[PDB]
Amino acid sequence: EYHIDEEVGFALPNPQENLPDFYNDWMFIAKHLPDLIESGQLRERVEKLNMLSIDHLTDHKSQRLARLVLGCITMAYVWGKGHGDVRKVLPRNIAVPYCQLSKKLELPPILVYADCVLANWKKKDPNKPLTYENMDVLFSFRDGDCSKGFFLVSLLVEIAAASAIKVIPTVFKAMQMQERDTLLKALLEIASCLEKALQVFHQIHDHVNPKAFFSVLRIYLSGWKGNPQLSDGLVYEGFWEDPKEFAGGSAGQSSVFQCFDVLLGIQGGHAAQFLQDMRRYMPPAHRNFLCSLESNPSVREFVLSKGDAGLREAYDACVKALVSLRSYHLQIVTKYILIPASQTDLMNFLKTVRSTTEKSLLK
Amino acid sequence: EYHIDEEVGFALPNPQENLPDFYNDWMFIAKHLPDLIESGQLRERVEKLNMLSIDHLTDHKSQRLARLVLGCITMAYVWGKGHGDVRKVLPRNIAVPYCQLSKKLELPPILVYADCVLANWKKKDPNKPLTYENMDVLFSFRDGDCSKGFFLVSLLVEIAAASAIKVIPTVFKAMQMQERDTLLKALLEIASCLEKALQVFHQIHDHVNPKAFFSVLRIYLSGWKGNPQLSDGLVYEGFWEDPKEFAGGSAGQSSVFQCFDVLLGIQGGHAAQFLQDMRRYMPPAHRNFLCSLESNPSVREFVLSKGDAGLREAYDACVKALVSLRSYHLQIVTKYILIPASQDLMNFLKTVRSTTEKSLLK
Numbered sequence: 001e002y003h004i005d006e007e008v009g010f011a012l013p014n015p016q017e018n019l020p021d022f023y024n025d026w027m028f029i030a031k032h033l034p035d036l037i038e039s040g041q042l043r044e045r046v047e048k049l050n051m052l053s054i055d056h057l058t059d060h061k062s063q064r065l066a067r068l069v070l071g072c073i074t075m076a077y078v079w080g081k082g083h084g085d086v087r088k089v090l091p092r093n094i095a096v097p098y099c100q101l102s103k104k105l106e107l108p109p110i111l112v113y114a115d116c117v118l119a120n121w122k123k124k125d126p127n128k129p130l131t132y133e134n135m136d137v138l139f140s141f142r143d144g145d146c147s148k149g150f151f152l153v154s155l156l157v158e159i160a161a162a163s164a165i166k167v168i169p170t171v172f173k174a175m176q177m178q179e180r181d182t183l184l185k186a187l188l189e190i191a192s193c194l195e196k197a198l199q200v201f202h203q204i205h206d207h208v209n210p211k212a213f214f215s216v217l218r219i220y221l222s223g224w225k226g227n228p229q230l231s232d233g234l235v236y237e238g239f240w241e242d243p244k245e246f247a248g249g250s251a252g253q254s255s256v257f258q259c260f261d262v263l264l265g266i267q268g269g270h271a272a273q274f275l276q277d278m279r280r281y282m283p284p285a286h287r288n289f290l291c292s293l294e295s296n297p298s299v300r301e302f303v304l305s306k307g308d309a310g311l312r313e314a315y316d317a318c319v320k321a322l323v324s325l326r327s328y329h330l331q332i333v334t335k336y337i338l339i340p341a342s343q344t345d346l347m348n349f350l351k352t353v354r355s356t357t358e359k360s361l362l363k
Numbered sequence: 364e365y366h367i368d369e370e371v372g373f374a375l376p377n378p379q380e381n382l383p384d385f386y387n388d389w390m391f392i393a394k395h396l397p398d399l400i401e402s403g404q405l406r407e408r409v410e411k412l413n414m415l416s417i418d419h420l421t422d423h424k425s426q427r428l429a430r431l432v433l434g435c436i437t438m439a440y441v442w443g444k445g446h447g448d449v450r451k452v453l454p455r456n457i458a459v460p461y462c463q464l465s466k467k468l469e470l471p472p473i474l475v476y477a478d479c480v481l482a483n484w485k486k487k488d489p490n491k492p493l494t495y496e497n498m499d500v501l502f503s504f505r506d507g508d509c510s511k512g513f514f515l516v517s518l519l520v521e522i523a524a525a526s527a528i529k530v531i532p533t534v535f536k537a538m539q540m541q542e543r544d545t546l547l548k549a550l551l552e553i554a555s556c557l558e559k560a561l562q563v564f565h566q567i568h569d570h571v572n573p574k575a576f577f578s579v580l581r582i583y584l585s586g587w588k589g590n591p592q593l594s595d596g597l598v599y600e601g602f603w604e605d606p607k608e609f610a611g612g613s614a615g616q617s618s619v620f621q622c623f624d625v626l627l628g629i630q631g632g633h634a635a636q637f638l639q640d641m642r643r644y645m646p647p648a649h650r651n652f653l654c655s656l657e658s659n660p661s662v663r664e665f666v667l668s669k670g671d672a673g674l675r676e677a678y679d680a681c682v683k684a685l686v687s688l689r690s691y692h693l694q695i696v697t698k699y700i701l702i703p704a705s706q707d708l709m710n711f712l713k714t715v716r717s718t719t720e721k722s723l724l725k
């Protein structure tokens with residue numbers, strides 16, 4: 001019901017690769033961003049684009065592909081080469097269909113995790129499994145940006161954590177039937193799956209370069225909420241008369257991070273409001289899921305009420321798995337953002353969320 | 364999409380009054396609770412009842428009516444006359460269908476606000492409006508329990524607050540189009556509607572007696588979560604082998620209270636977990652609505668960013684309206700619970716009222 005595949009999880013299973021003949025002009029630009037950004041012929045091709053109606057995007061996978069197409073074009077139109085020459089107005093020809101499509105899918109008109117990671121992938125050979133070697137991305141921004149490395153390693157973590165999500169029904173079924181051994185194995189499988197997701201995340205070092213990420217890709221994943229370059233926001237010509245502020249990319253847009261926090265009862269001020277705001281950037285069905293988990297019986301309260309050492313240890317195994325992921329996430333933010341920048345605000349938020357996870361330990 | 368009527372709001376519009384011929388034995392008992400409890404024939408009628416399948420309850424209104432029927436019978440079977448003679452096991456021929464129906468509707472197998480208030484009403488004359496004089500309840504527990512007074516005055520507050528809910532789309536539409544004057548009128552209409560709901564709540568004194576409420580009705584609205592009488596819970600024979608703990612009645616089961624807290628950005632520990640637990644006791648469509656409001660742009664953050672005195676004052680008008688309702692609620696809990704008892708719930712209400720007071724801007 002909440003669009004969560006057993007294998008792929010929150011990611012879009014088998015994303016669509018081609019749009020109908022009607023949107024060939026949109027597809028041409030998005031597929032040639034590395035060439036158009038470098039030559040500078042991008043903004044002219046976006047400005048000389050005719051206004052296409054979103055009526056031919058009938059199914060969810062085509063609507064999601066068109067959002068990925070328009071989203072990547074919008075970030076390339078706004079940032080350009082990334083040397084201060086920025087655009088504060090998105091042309092009517094592209095801003096009104098992108099906002100109509102974003103309204104239909106209940107997502108903000110900005111490139112989001114659901115678009116550039118969850119719907120931006122394919123299998124090279126459909127016979128082989130979901131491994132980096134047998135996978136590729138549909139869209140990139142520049143040659144050498146490490147977008148194949150960044151988006152695929154992010155996606156591989158989502159697929160690794162999807163194994164823990166399919167265990168969630170078993171957790172609540174065991175609490176209803178008072179099956180201690182069934183509940184204990186379920187909590188251990190969630191912990192084992194979250195530990196395996198950390199090992200998958202180690203592959204970032206193999207396929208992403210810190211200099212290329214910080215000074216090339218990171219520009220195209222940046223938004224216009226609190227950014228001094230677009231202090232007031234971006235004007236979506238034809239749709240809104242005032243500039244609108246929408247946030248850029250962040251690990252908080254992944255529903256997997258917030259999924260196990262809500263499952264384990266891990267509930268301050270500036271950090272709490274930011275994570276609640278990040279749900280607006282997730283697909284509507286995934287927010288309805290994160291919220292249905294909140295209204296399910298508390299796993300934390302049940303384990304504490306039983307006064308069982310085994311269940312308390314198995315609960316702390318899942319908590320320690322989340323702190324290990326957030327600690328290693330901070331280590332990667334140091335390598336890919338702090339070190340290249342000095343050649344900070346994000347770290348404080350991550351340190352705060354990690355301390356709240358550590359405080360949720362029972363032992 | 365979230366089952367919120369424009370006129371009646373979260374309440375069930377036009378609740379069904381009769382069940383199919385198949386459930387006449389269930390209906391007979393529920394409609395005669397005052398007679399069967401007083402004579403003591405109730406438990407014998409529940410125990411000599413045959414097991415009826417819930418397959419003939421096809422539509423939502425019939426399923427909700429059957430949950431109100433079985434819910435009132437279950438509270439009467441558990442508590443009885445209310446003099447310590449309590450039942451710790453609900454018979455298989457009523458516990459299984461009630462749990463099957465509760466699972467289908469995604470509600471706990473215990474009498475809940477959605478049942479005894481939202482689906483427990485009718486219009487005497489369909490031509491006249493929704494006023495206490497033109498309304499009545501479908502089920503009562505005892506003669507003189509003031510259930511018509513308690514459930515109808517609770518419902519009339521829900522209908523009064525429903526006028527504020529229909530302006531919620533206007534609040535978000537104004538924020539998206541930067542219309543300061545339409546947003547200010549919208550916040551003032553929410554405040555005016557929540558102030559009118561407080562005036563409709565004053566009618567409780569006219570139709571409910573403190574002694575009758577505390578020593579008669581209150582026992583049938585009590586549950587088995589933390590209750591020393593059913594320390595372990597209630598055994599739903601045939602459905603679960605272990606006793607289960609489900610909470611009784613409270614104002615927290617109303618979605619209207621949490622609706623405007625989420626709309627205005629009003630969020631400690633024991634109080635926060637209790638309100639999140641009370642969502643489980645609300646209908647599934649209503650808890651999905653309270654959660655969709657959380658993922659909408661913050662009204663509190665907008666009024667603060669604009670730095671406008673008018674919007675700040677109109678926001679505080681809605682906050683002060685919530686503070687007035689919670690202060691008058693505490694005031695009624697003193698009259699109908701604290702005074703009759705001397706012849707804990709207060710701490711929770713004082714805590715949730717201080718959090719509302721703290722969210723004022725001025």
Ligand SMILES: CCCOc1c(CCC)cc(-c2ccccc2-c2nnn[nH]2)cc1NC(=O)Nc1ccc(C)cc1
Nearest residue numbers: 111112113154157221249250251253254329332333336
């Ligand atoms: C559970 C999956 C989370 O995935 C991420 C992880 C994994 C952590 C367990 C790490 C990082 C990261 C890596 C290097 C440097 C910095 C960051 C970083 N983490 N926060 N902020 N910056 C990033 C993400 N995701 C992300 O950037 N998505 C996104 C991308 C593009 C758009 C438009 C929207 C969302």
Ligand SMILES: CCCOc1c(CCC)cc(-c2ccccc2-c2nnn[nH]2)cc1NC(=O)Nc1ccc(C)cc1
Nearest residue numbers: 474475476517520584612613614616617692695696699
């Ligand atoms: C939408 C309005 C809120 O409704 C209530 C208000 C209005 C306050 C604005 C007051 C009271 C109250 C009155 C007298 C003495 C005590 C209480 C009391 N307040 N907390 N707990 N007891 C009660 C409720 N509601 C309620 O009892 N519902 C319920 C009833 C039965 C079952 C099975 C489930 C839920």
